[PDB]
Amino acid sequence: DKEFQVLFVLTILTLISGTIFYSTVEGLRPIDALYFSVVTLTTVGYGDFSPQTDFGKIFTILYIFIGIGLVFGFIHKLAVNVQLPSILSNLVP
Amino acid sequence: DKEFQVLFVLTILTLISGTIFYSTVEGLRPIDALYFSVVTLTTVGYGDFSPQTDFGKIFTILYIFIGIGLVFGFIHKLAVNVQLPSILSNLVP
Amino acid sequence: DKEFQVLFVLTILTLISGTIFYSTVEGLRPIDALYFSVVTLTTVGYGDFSPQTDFGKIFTILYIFIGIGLVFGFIHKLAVNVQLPSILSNLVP
Amino acid sequence: DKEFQVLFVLTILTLISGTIFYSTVEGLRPIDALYFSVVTLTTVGYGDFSPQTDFGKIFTILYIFIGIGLVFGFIHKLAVNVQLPSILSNLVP
Ligand SMILES: [Rb+]
Ligand SMILES: [Rb+]
Ligand SMILES: [Rb+]
């Protein structure tokens, strides 16, 4: 509950940072930058977007190292502390 | 057993949702949409397919966050509660 | 030791299967098919190669679900039961 | 502390190796090679860069298997032994 709340907030802030950075330095629209930030930190990494500037590459290196742990923490607690009880609730006779 | 059964079903439903969504909104064939849904949620993310519409990008953000935990749960219990005993069975003298 | 040995063998067989499949059905050279099989099951997924046939897409769906757990098992025990002691050995005064 | 210190050093050395290898054999600039090494070992795998030579493909296979465990170890202990207390410190009334 409180754990999930913190991780949601932390995830939102990280994604806001990426949205601002990539829309500014890499010139992406502020939906494409959000989309790209999510595709990056979840490691899906389609490559339809990727940094073309050296500033962007360096930021992306740091963004990945800092952001992956947080994003996957959130995914983990979202699945465990929100999705897992909910699926069980849909089971009990 | 019962755990694996639930996770298979949950995984199938998630993949059906993606198949329907991406075939409709992104115009993919209903084998390409399934393939793309799997490549996305397993985070392989080749990028031979990716959403081109804003609707598709927004759905993909949510689809990844909701679906990755479930898909990797299934992969985990498939490997542990199905593959792991099977490999041991092929070992015992 | 015995654990790592089994996982290496299991990983090799999975990669041989992919090498054979993608060189045959997708027409890749039998170094490109191995390379592509590894890039797939480790989820790096560059997309410089990807299946173009429906046979290839369907196999890839199944290959990912079956193979990821095994490959990451091996990576995990390679890091823990081989790399982790080795790094400690290079430490003790 | 000491754990994180070792993993940072180990991660740096692995990334230096990739930077040297891909700048030499694949002809990348020594910022693009670092960027590509990071995108590879974190499994983001955009594919804006990828090995074009057989030497590069073979090295990449081995680099991924050896490097992923270490890089994700570092990410894990960076998130747990550095980020996790820091976020808690910003919480206590
Ligand atoms: Rb990935
Ligand atoms: Rb990827
Ligand atoms: Rb990719």
Short mmCIF file of all heavy atoms in Angstrom, two decimals, chain B residues 30-83:
data_model
loop_
_atom_site.label_atom_id
_atom_site.label_comp_id
_atom_site.label_asym_id
_atom_site.label_seq_id
_atom_site.Cartn_x
_atom_site.Cartn_y
_atom_site.Cartn_z
N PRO B 30 -3.56 -10.34 -37.42
CA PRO B 30 -3.74 -11.18 -36.23
C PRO B 30 -2.91 -12.46 -36.20
O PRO B 30 -3.42 -13.53 -35.85
CB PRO B 30 -5.23 -11.55 -36.28
CG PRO B 30 -5.82 -10.68 -37.31
CD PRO B 30 -4.75 -10.41 -38.29
N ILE B 31 -1.68 -12.36 -36.66
CA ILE B 31 -0.61 -13.22 -36.19
C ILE B 31 0.54 -12.28 -35.83
O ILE B 31 1.30 -12.55 -34.91
CB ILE B 31 -0.18 -14.27 -37.24
CG1 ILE B 31 0.99 -15.11 -36.74
CG2 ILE B 31 0.14 -13.61 -38.57
CD1 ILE B 31 0.65 -16.03 -35.58
N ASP B 32 0.64 -11.20 -36.59
CA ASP B 32 1.70 -10.21 -36.33
C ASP B 32 1.40 -9.51 -35.01
O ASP B 32 2.32 -9.19 -34.24
CB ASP B 32 1.80 -9.20 -37.47
CG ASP B 32 2.47 -9.78 -38.71
OD1 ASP B 32 3.26 -10.73 -38.56
OD2 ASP B 32 2.25 -9.26 -39.81
N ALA B 33 0.12 -9.27 -34.72
CA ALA B 33 -0.21 -8.62 -33.45
C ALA B 33 0.10 -9.52 -32.24
O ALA B 33 0.58 -9.05 -31.21
CB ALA B 33 -1.69 -8.21 -33.44
N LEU B 34 -0.17 -10.81 -32.36
CA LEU B 34 0.20 -11.75 -31.31
C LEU B 34 1.71 -11.81 -31.15
O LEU B 34 2.22 -11.69 -30.05
CB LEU B 34 -0.32 -13.16 -31.63
CG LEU B 34 0.09 -14.23 -30.63
CD1 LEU B 34 -0.48 -13.99 -29.22
CD2 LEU B 34 -0.35 -15.60 -31.16
N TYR B 35 2.41 -12.02 -32.25
CA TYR B 35 3.86 -12.04 -32.26
C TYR B 35 4.42 -10.76 -31.60
O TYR B 35 5.27 -10.86 -30.71
CB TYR B 35 4.33 -12.22 -33.71
CG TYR B 35 5.76 -11.86 -33.99
CD1 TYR B 35 6.79 -12.69 -33.56
CD2 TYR B 35 6.06 -10.70 -34.66
CE1 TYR B 35 8.11 -12.34 -33.82
CE2 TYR B 35 7.38 -10.35 -34.92
CZ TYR B 35 8.38 -11.17 -34.50
OH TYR B 35 9.68 -10.79 -34.76
N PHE B 36 3.92 -9.60 -32.02
CA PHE B 36 4.38 -8.30 -31.46
C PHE B 36 4.05 -8.18 -29.96
O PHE B 36 4.88 -7.69 -29.17
CB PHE B 36 3.74 -7.14 -32.23
CG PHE B 36 4.00 -5.79 -31.62
CD1 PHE B 36 5.28 -5.31 -31.51
CD2 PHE B 36 2.97 -5.02 -31.14
CE1 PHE B 36 5.55 -4.07 -30.96
CE2 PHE B 36 3.23 -3.78 -30.57
CZ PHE B 36 4.52 -3.30 -30.48
N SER B 37 2.86 -8.63 -29.56
CA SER B 37 2.50 -8.62 -28.14
C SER B 37 3.47 -9.45 -27.30
O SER B 37 3.89 -9.04 -26.22
CB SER B 37 1.04 -9.11 -27.94
OG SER B 37 0.16 -8.20 -28.56
N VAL B 38 3.86 -10.63 -27.81
CA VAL B 38 4.79 -11.49 -27.10
C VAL B 38 6.19 -10.86 -27.05
O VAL B 38 6.82 -10.84 -26.00
CB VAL B 38 4.88 -12.89 -27.76
CG1 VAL B 38 6.05 -13.68 -27.21
CG2 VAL B 38 3.58 -13.67 -27.55
N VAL B 39 6.65 -10.34 -28.18
CA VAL B 39 8.00 -9.74 -28.28
C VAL B 39 8.08 -8.51 -27.35
O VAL B 39 9.12 -8.24 -26.75
CB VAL B 39 8.32 -9.38 -29.76
CG1 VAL B 39 9.50 -8.42 -29.91
CG2 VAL B 39 8.57 -10.69 -30.58
N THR B 40 6.96 -7.80 -27.20
CA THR B 40 6.87 -6.68 -26.28
C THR B 40 6.93 -7.12 -24.82
O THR B 40 7.79 -6.64 -24.06
CB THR B 40 5.58 -5.89 -26.57
OG1 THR B 40 5.69 -5.28 -27.86
CG2 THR B 40 5.33 -4.80 -25.50
N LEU B 41 6.04 -8.02 -24.40
CA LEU B 41 5.91 -8.31 -22.97
C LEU B 41 7.06 -9.15 -22.44
O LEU B 41 7.32 -9.14 -21.25
CB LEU B 41 4.57 -9.00 -22.67
CG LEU B 41 3.39 -8.06 -22.87
CD1 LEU B 41 2.13 -8.78 -22.47
CD2 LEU B 41 3.52 -6.72 -22.09
N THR B 42 7.75 -9.88 -23.32
CA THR B 42 8.97 -10.56 -22.91
C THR B 42 10.20 -9.65 -22.94
O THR B 42 11.29 -10.09 -22.56
CB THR B 42 9.25 -11.79 -23.77
OG1 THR B 42 9.42 -11.39 -25.14
CG2 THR B 42 8.09 -12.80 -23.65
N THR B 43 9.99 -8.41 -23.39
CA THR B 43 10.99 -7.31 -23.51
C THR B 43 12.06 -7.57 -24.55
O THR B 43 13.06 -6.84 -24.62
CB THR B 43 11.71 -6.96 -22.15
OG1 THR B 43 12.68 -7.95 -21.79
CG2 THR B 43 10.72 -6.81 -21.02
N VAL B 44 11.85 -8.55 -25.41
CA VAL B 44 12.79 -8.76 -26.52
C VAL B 44 12.80 -7.51 -27.44
O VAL B 44 13.87 -6.97 -27.79
CB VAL B 44 12.41 -10.05 -27.32
CG1 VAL B 44 13.25 -10.18 -28.58
CG2 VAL B 44 12.62 -11.32 -26.46
N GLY B 45 11.62 -7.03 -27.83
CA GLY B 45 11.49 -5.72 -28.47
C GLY B 45 12.30 -5.48 -29.73
O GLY B 45 12.96 -4.46 -29.88
N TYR B 46 12.23 -6.43 -30.67
CA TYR B 46 12.98 -6.28 -31.93
C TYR B 46 12.76 -4.95 -32.62
O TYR B 46 13.69 -4.38 -33.19
CB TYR B 46 12.60 -7.35 -32.92
CG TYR B 46 12.90 -8.77 -32.55
CD1 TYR B 46 11.89 -9.72 -32.64
CD2 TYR B 46 14.17 -9.20 -32.17
CE1 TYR B 46 12.11 -11.04 -32.32
CE2 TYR B 46 14.40 -10.54 -31.85
CZ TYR B 46 13.35 -11.44 -31.94
OH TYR B 46 13.57 -12.77 -31.64
N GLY B 47 11.52 -4.47 -32.60
CA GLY B 47 11.20 -3.23 -33.28
C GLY B 47 10.84 -3.41 -34.74
O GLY B 47 10.72 -2.41 -35.46
N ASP B 48 10.69 -4.66 -35.20
CA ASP B 48 10.18 -4.86 -36.55
C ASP B 48 8.73 -4.39 -36.62
O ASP B 48 8.27 -3.94 -37.67
CB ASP B 48 10.31 -6.32 -37.01
CG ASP B 48 9.83 -7.34 -35.98
OD1 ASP B 48 9.60 -7.00 -34.81
OD2 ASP B 48 9.73 -8.54 -36.37
N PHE B 49 8.06 -4.46 -35.49
CA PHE B 49 6.76 -3.81 -35.29
C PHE B 49 6.89 -2.91 -34.07
O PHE B 49 7.61 -3.23 -33.13
CB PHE B 49 5.63 -4.83 -35.08
CG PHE B 49 5.43 -5.76 -36.27
CD1 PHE B 49 6.09 -6.98 -36.32
CD2 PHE B 49 4.60 -5.41 -37.32
CE1 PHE B 49 5.92 -7.85 -37.43
CE2 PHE B 49 4.43 -6.28 -38.42
CZ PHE B 49 5.09 -7.47 -38.46
N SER B 50 6.15 -1.80 -34.09
CA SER B 50 6.06 -0.87 -32.98
C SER B 50 4.87 0.06 -33.27
O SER B 50 4.54 0.27 -34.44
CB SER B 50 7.36 -0.07 -32.78
OG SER B 50 7.72 0.62 -33.98
N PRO B 51 4.26 0.62 -32.23
CA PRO B 51 3.07 1.44 -32.47
C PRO B 51 3.43 2.73 -33.16
O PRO B 51 4.43 3.40 -32.82
CB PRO B 51 2.52 1.68 -31.06
CG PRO B 51 3.71 1.52 -30.14
CD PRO B 51 4.48 0.38 -30.79
N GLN B 52 2.61 3.09 -34.15
CA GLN B 52 2.82 4.32 -34.90
C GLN B 52 1.81 5.39 -34.53
O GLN B 52 2.02 6.55 -34.83
CB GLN B 52 2.75 4.04 -36.39
CG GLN B 52 3.80 3.04 -36.87
CD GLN B 52 3.69 2.77 -38.35
OE1 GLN B 52 4.36 3.42 -39.16
NE2 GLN B 52 2.85 1.81 -38.72
N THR B 53 0.72 4.98 -33.90
CA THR B 53 -0.30 5.94 -33.48
C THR B 53 -0.15 6.33 -32.01
O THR B 53 0.42 5.58 -31.22
CB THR B 53 -1.73 5.40 -33.68
OG1 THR B 53 -1.99 4.37 -32.72
CG2 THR B 53 -1.93 4.88 -35.11
N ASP B 54 -0.69 7.48 -31.63
CA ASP B 54 -0.56 7.91 -30.23
C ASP B 54 -1.39 7.02 -29.32
O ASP B 54 -0.96 6.69 -28.22
CB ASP B 54 -0.95 9.38 -30.06
CG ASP B 54 0.11 10.33 -30.58
OD1 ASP B 54 1.20 9.87 -31.00
OD2 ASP B 54 -0.12 11.57 -30.58
N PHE B 55 -2.58 6.63 -29.77
CA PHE B 55 -3.35 5.62 -29.11
C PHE B 55 -2.50 4.36 -28.85
O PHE B 55 -2.51 3.80 -27.76
CB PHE B 55 -4.55 5.27 -30.00
CG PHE B 55 -5.64 4.54 -29.31
CD1 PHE B 55 -5.54 4.20 -27.97
CD2 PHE B 55 -6.77 4.16 -30.01
CE1 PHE B 55 -6.55 3.50 -27.34
CE2 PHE B 55 -7.78 3.46 -29.39
CZ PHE B 55 -7.67 3.13 -28.06
N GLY B 56 -1.77 3.93 -29.87
CA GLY B 56 -0.95 2.73 -29.76
C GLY B 56 0.20 2.90 -28.78
O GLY B 56 0.51 1.99 -28.01
N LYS B 57 0.81 4.07 -28.79
CA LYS B 57 1.91 4.35 -27.86
C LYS B 57 1.42 4.36 -26.41
O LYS B 57 2.05 3.77 -25.52
CB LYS B 57 2.60 5.66 -28.22
CG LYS B 57 3.46 5.52 -29.48
CD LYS B 57 3.84 6.87 -30.08
CE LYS B 57 4.65 6.60 -31.36
NZ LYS B 57 4.83 7.83 -32.16
N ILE B 58 0.29 5.02 -26.18
CA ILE B 58 -0.26 5.09 -24.84
C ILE B 58 -0.70 3.73 -24.32
O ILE B 58 -0.35 3.34 -23.19
CB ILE B 58 -1.46 6.08 -24.79
CG1 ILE B 58 -0.98 7.50 -25.09
CG2 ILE B 58 -2.18 6.00 -23.43
CD1 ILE B 58 -2.09 8.43 -25.57
N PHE B 59 -1.45 2.97 -25.13
CA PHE B 59 -1.78 1.59 -24.79
C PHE B 59 -0.52 0.76 -24.48
O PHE B 59 -0.52 -0.02 -23.54
CB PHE B 59 -2.56 0.89 -25.92
CG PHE B 59 -2.87 -0.56 -25.64
CD1 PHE B 59 -4.00 -0.91 -24.89
CD2 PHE B 59 -2.05 -1.58 -26.12
CE1 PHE B 59 -4.28 -2.24 -24.62
CE2 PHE B 59 -2.31 -2.90 -25.84
CZ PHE B 59 -3.44 -3.26 -25.11
N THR B 60 0.53 0.93 -25.29
CA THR B 60 1.75 0.13 -25.14
C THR B 60 2.43 0.43 -23.80
O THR B 60 2.85 -0.50 -23.11
CB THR B 60 2.72 0.40 -26.30
OG1 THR B 60 2.07 -0.04 -27.51
CG2 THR B 60 4.06 -0.38 -26.14
N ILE B 61 2.46 1.69 -23.41
CA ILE B 61 2.95 2.07 -22.08
C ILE B 61 2.23 1.29 -20.99
O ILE B 61 2.85 0.68 -20.12
CB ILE B 61 2.79 3.58 -21.81
CG1 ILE B 61 3.85 4.37 -22.60
CG2 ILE B 61 2.96 3.88 -20.31
CD1 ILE B 61 3.49 5.85 -22.76
N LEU B 62 0.89 1.32 -21.03
CA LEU B 62 0.12 0.63 -20.01
C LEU B 62 0.22 -0.88 -20.12
O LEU B 62 0.30 -1.59 -19.12
CB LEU B 62 -1.35 1.09 -20.07
CG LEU B 62 -1.52 2.60 -19.91
CD1 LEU B 62 -2.98 3.03 -20.18
CD2 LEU B 62 -1.09 3.05 -18.52
N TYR B 63 0.21 -1.39 -21.35
CA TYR B 63 0.30 -2.81 -21.61
C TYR B 63 1.59 -3.41 -21.04
O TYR B 63 1.57 -4.48 -20.44
CB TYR B 63 0.22 -3.05 -23.12
CG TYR B 63 -0.01 -4.47 -23.56
CD1 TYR B 63 -1.14 -5.18 -23.16
CD2 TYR B 63 0.88 -5.08 -24.43
CE1 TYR B 63 -1.35 -6.49 -23.60
CE2 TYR B 63 0.68 -6.38 -24.88
CZ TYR B 63 -0.43 -7.08 -24.47
OH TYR B 63 -0.63 -8.37 -24.92
N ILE B 64 2.70 -2.70 -21.23
CA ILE B 64 3.99 -3.13 -20.71
C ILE B 64 3.97 -3.17 -19.19
O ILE B 64 4.31 -4.17 -18.58
CB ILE B 64 5.12 -2.22 -21.21
CG1 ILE B 64 5.38 -2.47 -22.69
CG2 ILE B 64 6.43 -2.49 -20.46
CD1 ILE B 64 6.34 -1.49 -23.26
N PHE B 65 3.53 -2.08 -18.56
CA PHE B 65 3.53 -2.05 -17.10
C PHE B 65 2.64 -3.13 -16.49
O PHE B 65 3.02 -3.77 -15.52
CB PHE B 65 3.12 -0.66 -16.62
CG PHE B 65 4.28 0.28 -16.45
CD1 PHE B 65 4.45 1.35 -17.32
CD2 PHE B 65 5.20 0.11 -15.43
CE1 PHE B 65 5.50 2.23 -17.18
CE2 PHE B 65 6.26 0.98 -15.28
CZ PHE B 65 6.42 2.04 -16.16
N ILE B 66 1.46 -3.37 -17.07
CA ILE B 66 0.56 -4.38 -16.54
C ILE B 66 1.02 -5.79 -16.91
O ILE B 66 0.95 -6.70 -16.09
CB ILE B 66 -0.87 -4.15 -17.05
CG1 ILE B 66 -1.38 -2.80 -16.56
CG2 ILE B 66 -1.80 -5.27 -16.57
CD1 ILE B 66 -2.74 -2.46 -17.10
N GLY B 67 1.48 -5.97 -18.14
CA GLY B 67 1.73 -7.30 -18.68
C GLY B 67 3.06 -7.97 -18.37
O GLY B 67 3.14 -9.20 -18.32
N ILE B 68 4.12 -7.18 -18.19
CA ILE B 68 5.45 -7.75 -17.95
C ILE B 68 5.50 -8.62 -16.70
O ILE B 68 6.06 -9.72 -16.73
CB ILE B 68 6.54 -6.66 -17.84
CG1 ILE B 68 6.97 -6.17 -19.22
CG2 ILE B 68 7.81 -7.21 -17.15
CD1 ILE B 68 8.17 -5.24 -19.15
N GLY B 69 4.91 -8.14 -15.61
CA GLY B 69 4.94 -8.89 -14.37
C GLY B 69 4.28 -10.25 -14.48
O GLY B 69 4.80 -11.25 -13.99
N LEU B 70 3.13 -10.28 -15.16
CA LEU B 70 2.38 -11.51 -15.40
C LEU B 70 3.10 -12.50 -16.31
O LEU B 70 3.18 -13.69 -16.03
CB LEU B 70 1.03 -11.17 -16.02
CG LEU B 70 0.15 -12.39 -16.18
CD1 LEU B 70 -0.56 -12.65 -14.86
CD2 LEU B 70 -0.84 -12.15 -17.30
N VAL B 71 3.60 -11.98 -17.43
CA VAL B 71 4.30 -12.80 -18.40
C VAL B 71 5.55 -13.41 -17.76
O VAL B 71 5.84 -14.59 -17.94
CB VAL B 71 4.66 -11.99 -19.66
CG1 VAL B 71 5.79 -12.65 -20.45
CG2 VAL B 71 3.42 -11.81 -20.53
N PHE B 72 6.31 -12.61 -17.02
CA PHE B 72 7.52 -13.16 -16.43
C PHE B 72 7.24 -14.04 -15.22
O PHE B 72 8.05 -14.91 -14.88
CB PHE B 72 8.49 -12.04 -16.09
CG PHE B 72 9.36 -11.68 -17.25
CD1 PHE B 72 8.96 -10.73 -18.17
CD2 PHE B 72 10.56 -12.35 -17.46
CE1 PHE B 72 9.75 -10.43 -19.26
CE2 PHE B 72 11.35 -12.05 -18.54
CZ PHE B 72 10.95 -11.09 -19.44
N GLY B 73 6.08 -13.85 -14.61
CA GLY B 73 5.61 -14.76 -13.57
C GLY B 73 5.41 -16.13 -14.18
O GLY B 73 5.90 -17.13 -13.66
N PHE B 74 4.68 -16.16 -15.29
CA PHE B 74 4.41 -17.40 -16.02
C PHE B 74 5.69 -18.09 -16.48
O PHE B 74 5.84 -19.30 -16.34
CB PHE B 74 3.52 -17.12 -17.23
CG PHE B 74 3.34 -18.30 -18.14
CD1 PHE B 74 2.52 -19.36 -17.77
CD2 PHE B 74 3.97 -18.35 -19.36
CE1 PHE B 74 2.35 -20.45 -18.61
CE2 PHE B 74 3.81 -19.44 -20.20
CZ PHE B 74 2.99 -20.49 -19.82
N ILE B 75 6.61 -17.31 -17.04
CA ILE B 75 7.89 -17.85 -17.48
C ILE B 75 8.62 -18.46 -16.29
O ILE B 75 9.20 -19.55 -16.39
CB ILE B 75 8.77 -16.77 -18.15
CG1 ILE B 75 8.13 -16.34 -19.47
CG2 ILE B 75 10.19 -17.28 -18.37
CD1 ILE B 75 8.85 -15.21 -20.17
N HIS B 76 8.57 -17.77 -15.16
CA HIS B 76 9.23 -18.23 -13.95
C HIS B 76 8.65 -19.54 -13.42
O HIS B 76 9.39 -20.45 -13.06
CB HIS B 76 9.15 -17.16 -12.86
CG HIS B 76 9.72 -17.59 -11.55
ND1 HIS B 76 9.15 -17.25 -10.34
CD2 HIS B 76 10.81 -18.34 -11.25
CE1 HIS B 76 9.87 -17.77 -9.36
NE2 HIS B 76 10.88 -18.43 -9.89
N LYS B 77 7.32 -19.65 -13.38
CA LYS B 77 6.69 -20.85 -12.86
C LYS B 77 6.67 -21.98 -13.89
O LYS B 77 6.66 -23.15 -13.53
CB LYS B 77 5.27 -20.55 -12.37
CG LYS B 77 5.24 -19.61 -11.17
CD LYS B 77 6.09 -20.13 -10.02
CE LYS B 77 6.14 -19.12 -8.88
NZ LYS B 77 7.01 -19.57 -7.75
N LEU B 78 6.68 -21.62 -15.17
CA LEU B 78 6.85 -22.60 -16.23
C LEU B 78 8.23 -23.26 -16.13
O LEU B 78 8.37 -24.47 -16.30
CB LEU B 78 6.69 -21.96 -17.61
CG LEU B 78 7.16 -22.77 -18.82
CD1 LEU B 78 6.28 -23.99 -19.04
CD2 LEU B 78 7.22 -21.91 -20.07
N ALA B 79 9.25 -22.46 -15.84
CA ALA B 79 10.61 -22.98 -15.73
C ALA B 79 10.81 -23.77 -14.44
O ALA B 79 11.52 -24.77 -14.42
CB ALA B 79 11.62 -21.84 -15.81
N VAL B 80 10.18 -23.31 -13.36
CA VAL B 80 10.35 -23.92 -12.05
C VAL B 80 9.42 -25.11 -11.81
O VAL B 80 9.85 -26.17 -11.37
CB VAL B 80 10.13 -22.89 -10.92
CG1 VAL B 80 10.03 -23.59 -9.57
CG2 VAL B 80 11.25 -21.86 -10.91
N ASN B 81 8.13 -24.92 -12.11
CA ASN B 81 7.14 -25.93 -11.77
C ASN B 81 6.77 -26.85 -12.93
O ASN B 81 5.83 -27.64 -12.82
CB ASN B 81 5.86 -25.26 -11.24
CG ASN B 81 6.11 -24.45 -9.98
OD1 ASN B 81 7.02 -24.74 -9.20
ND2 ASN B 81 5.30 -23.41 -9.76
N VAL B 82 7.50 -26.77 -14.04
CA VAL B 82 7.24 -27.64 -15.19
C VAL B 82 8.54 -28.12 -15.84
O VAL B 82 8.70 -29.31 -16.13
CB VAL B 82 6.37 -26.93 -16.26
CG1 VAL B 82 6.27 -27.79 -17.51
CG2 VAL B 82 4.98 -26.62 -15.71
N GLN B 83 9.46 -27.20 -16.08
CA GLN B 83 10.71 -27.53 -16.76
C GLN B 83 11.73 -28.14 -15.81
O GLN B 83 12.44 -29.09 -16.17
CB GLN B 83 11.29 -26.28 -17.44
CG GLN B 83 10.38 -25.71 -18.51
CD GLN B 83 10.99 -24.53 -19.24
OE1 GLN B 83 11.40 -23.54 -18.62
NE2 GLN B 83 11.06 -24.62 -20.56
#
